[PDB]
Design a protein around this ligand. Sequence first.
Ligand SMILES: NCCC[C@](N)(C(=O)O)C(F)F
Ligand SMILES: NCCC[C@](N)(C(=O)O)C(F)F
Ligand SMILES: NCCC[C@](N)(C(=O)O)C(F)F
Ligand SMILES: [Mn+2]
Ligand SMILES: [Mn+2]
Ligand SMILES: [Mn+2]
Ligand SMILES: [Mn+2]
Ligand SMILES: [Mn+2]
Ligand SMILES: [Mn+2]
Lengths: 315, 315, 315
Amino acid sequence: SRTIGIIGAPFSKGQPRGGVEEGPTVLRKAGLLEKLKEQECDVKDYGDLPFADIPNDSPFQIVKNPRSVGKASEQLAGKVAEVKKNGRISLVLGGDHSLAIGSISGHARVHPDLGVIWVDAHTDINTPLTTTSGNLHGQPVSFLLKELKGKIPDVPGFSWVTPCISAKDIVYIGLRDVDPGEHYILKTLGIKYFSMTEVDRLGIGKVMEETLSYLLGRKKRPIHLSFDVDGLDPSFTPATGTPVVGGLTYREGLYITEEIYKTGLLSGLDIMEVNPSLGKTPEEVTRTVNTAVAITLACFGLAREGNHKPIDYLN
Amino acid sequence: SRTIGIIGAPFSKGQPRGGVEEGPTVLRKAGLLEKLKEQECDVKDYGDLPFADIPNDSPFQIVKNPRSVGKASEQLAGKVAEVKKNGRISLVLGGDHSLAIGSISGHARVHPDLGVIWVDAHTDINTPLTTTSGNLHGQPVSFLLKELKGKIPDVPGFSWVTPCISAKDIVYIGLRDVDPGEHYILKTLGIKYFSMTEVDRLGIGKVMEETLSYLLGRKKRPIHLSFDVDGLDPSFTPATGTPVVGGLTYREGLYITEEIYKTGLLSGLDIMEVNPSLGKTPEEVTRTVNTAVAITLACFGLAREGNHKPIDYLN
Amino acid sequence: SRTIGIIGAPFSKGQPRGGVEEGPTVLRKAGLLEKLKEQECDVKDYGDLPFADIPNDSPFQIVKNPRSVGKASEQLAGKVAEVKKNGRISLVLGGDHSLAIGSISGHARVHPDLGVIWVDAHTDINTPLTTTSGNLHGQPVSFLLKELKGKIPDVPGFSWVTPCISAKDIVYIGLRDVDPGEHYILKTLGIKYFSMTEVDRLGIGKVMEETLSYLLGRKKRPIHLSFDVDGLDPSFTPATGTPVVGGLTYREGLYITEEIYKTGLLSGLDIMEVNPSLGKTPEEVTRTVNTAVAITLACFGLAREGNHKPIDYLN
Ligand SMILES: NCCC[C@](N)(C(=O)O)C(F)F
Ligand SMILES: NCCC[C@](N)(C(=O)O)C(F)F
Ligand SMILES: NCCC[C@](N)(C(=O)O)C(F)F
Ligand SMILES: [Mn+2]
Ligand SMILES: [Mn+2]
Ligand SMILES: [Mn+2]
Ligand SMILES: [Mn+2]
Ligand SMILES: [Mn+2]
Ligand SMILES: [Mn+2]
């Protein structure tokens, strides 16, 4: 049986565009909890984290909303660790991707040996000093890498953060818009990644084989999947802040998650960057949310070949 | 030379939505016969089977229109066997997929050693007792499997049916919406299938290699291809009753058929579930019909790399 | 460092539809030169070739605008050779594909050992005697193949042409609409090609591996990439004269070019068949031009995994 611990993270200050804080709302409204239960899922909803308003939050150099972002992650990290302690797979509904800082931090407290699979069109590994946008949803990974600590200045709101993952414990999938400073870090720390170029070259099947083999090779350990919806092509998830054409297909998106599910090691899951406000049409909103639900459902068992209970259907 | 035996099957009572009985009409109207002849094809049109109206046809338990469905298949089976006896590849233009019962039955009378390749988003293998919709276009395969006879209650209209294929003589390609009872049967009878998950993992090239090797391995035998248009992604065949996103691409659709054609063993072909009435726009109708024609034309020789007659074009 | 030699070729008489002569305009207007410079690119723009109007140009048999087409290519060939002599990668912005005759001819004068990679939905290898359309953008390759000289009648405007490539020095990628006479030539001269069928079967990664291995195997030599935008699926490049569904994806398009770039052998590049007038909407125009720019930028270094200067971004 697979127990789920739902955590709503209606937060948007890791980026400029509002509306992404509605992500938990539209996803639940789409019947996510219900559909999860329609499967062999034991679902416990921990509600939506109430992210107090931090009015005084001027930029730190160019990094925007550091205190707001830092606090939201701090709050989430605690809630995530709480759900993990209850022996449940934490399902964080975002909210912008900056929340990954708290989600992965909290997860690592209960499971320090975790491995991260990051599905995104971006590496979100800019440091406060390499970022040019100042948007924190483009910097979460820098705050989590042990090898980058020291390159991370003390940004207000993140004194609680302690890098908990090594460059070797994370795999990127779907990259197609990487900043120069971000690429330097990729090549410098020797981070394992499968940009869209690698997916084209190898095919999603080999990509996933290499991903799980790379992270689970030596030994088995909890898997944290941080899924940024803009990792999938905009044709499937248009209502998102930073879309980039030439993304992972709906099928590849489901393949990734089906395979991760089959490992039986999914321990933490993030469904980020869904912003209903950015849908150019009501259908772009449903299309985005629907795809987001599908990916989530696959993470927890829904297989395209079919599913059946341990019963004799013919009798 | 390849001789074709066209059979129109304007039938829709295997499902709720009407309009699919217009399939033969829109396909012929698209120049299918003509385009087939524009190739090295010897085409003989046997017209549209006149499916008498069966007014008294109340559900059998929950199975809807059993007598209407059963009769249409019985009629088709005879016409199909007739075309086969004339040494022609039977091309059945549907019509809902319930017709596969008659199409495959009739084919198997003249060629009992046939192997079936089923391209569909569904397995259509529900039995009258496992189906929840009661729609017979979701049960054709159950009536044809020898191993399932005994699990098939005597449904009015199907006393003429005799299972003619074993679980080992059929291969599914494109599955992405399989019912629980259907999956049980898949795993229980050991049926060979390549859901969308397998296509993603292996690629359509290996998928097809494994399909033909699995069916033609031991020895060569007639191939029956039952192609449900909803097997292809709805982006290519929207005007269909039961569309499911994340389907086979137009390219994969053509690859499947080009490869099947190259075997020189195509013996029976079904082009099912095309419903012009379900097109949200006149373009969705043409898009659907056009793709349906393309797939058909590929089954009979049209190769994307090109075709040329046994002549010296340079002279 | 990679030096670029931009050449605008606003020419359309190799085909019926006007507007393609606006290709250089819309591409430059899209910031192509600027974006190229935004990379490690040394860009020198040689302007748009002024293709004098040739009023008297009646068909030669059925071949249309032979003198106009022949002259434009003759002019381009000279400009191309000029740019090559300046040690620059020639970037020809078309204009219809008939220009490939001049582009490849001029390139071969400075680099006779060149190898051609032809990305297109068509083989454009019809001879004046095999063509049925009479449109010269469907005949460029016939005029360039040494093995076909003798099958090429003396068409007004092409007395300057001298076949400069052998059937063995060119690879086609993306074929899906090949004329009968064109296919005969393919199979007769033993030309290496990867129609869409081969791409489906092997995947773009192996396709490219085989392409570069086939052309660069024996030894390294300059690469001429003639990219017809209709090689990519119409979903990405709709504003083009002869679109064909089931084309190369945006991703495959970028993969092809990224790999060609990685060889460090790109010597000549053609971006052809972009026709703004054929966009059914202003967005189809931008979509087409944007994709055309992306492909170009990838040819010169833009990698989806990211790019970074030879600096220490962390410091
Ligand atoms: N999650 C979005 C990341 C986008 C980003 N790389 C950034 O750092 O802001 C770009 F906008 F430069
Ligand atoms: N050909 C459609 C099959 C759909 C079906 N599996 C069915 O049996 O009706 C679903 F509706 F449950
Ligand atoms: N570049 C377009 C080629 C199209 C063509 N093969 C031709 O030769 O015109 C067809 F129209 F027949
Ligand atoms: Mn992203
Ligand atoms: Mn992200
Ligand atoms: Mn179906
Ligand atoms: Mn079906
Ligand atoms: Mn073309
Ligand atoms: Mn061309």
